[PDB]
């Protein structure tokens, strides 16, 4: 059950940070978020994501709306 809260969204970058339970900001990508309607993450909103491996950080892929 991979739940996370949107910390802050780098709209001008096309990326964002979603907290893991230990505060570990997971790095989400524009092509990882389901940009249905709008391509942004509501800061403070809780969602789910399919976290993948990443050499330079946890890859927040396949973002599912809670």
Curated annotation (Swiss-Prot):
Induction statement: In response to low temperature.
An example molecular function term from Gene Ontology annotations: DNA binding
GO process annotations (BP): mRNA stabilization; regulation of gene expression
Classification via SUPFAM superfamilies: Nucleic acid-binding proteins
Pfam families: CSD
Cited Gene3D superfamilies: 6.20.370.130, Nucleic acid-binding proteins
Residue ranges of domain CSD in the record: 4-63
UniProt keyword terms in alphabetical order: Activator, Cytoplasm, DNA-binding, Stress response, Transcription, Transcription regulation
PROSITE patterns xref list: CSD_1, CSD_2
Principal location listed in the UniProt entry: cytoplasm
Intracellular or extracellular location(s): Cytoplasm
Coiled-coil spans in chain: none
Gene Ontology annotations for the cellular component aspect, listed alphabetically: cytoplasm
Subunit structure: Homodimer.
Protein known as: Cold shock-like protein CspLA
Record organism: Listeria monocytogenes serovar 1/2a (strain ATCC BAA-679 / EGD-e)
């Amino acid at each position: 059950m991979e739940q996370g809260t949107v910390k802050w969204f780098n709209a001008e970058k096309g990326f964002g940070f979603i907290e893991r339970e230990n505060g570990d900001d997971v790095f989400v990508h524009f092509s990882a978020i389901q940009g249905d309607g709008f391509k942004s993450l509501d800061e403070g909103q809780a969602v789910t994501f399919d976290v993948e491996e990443g050499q330079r950080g946890p890859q927040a892929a396949n973002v599912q709306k809670a």
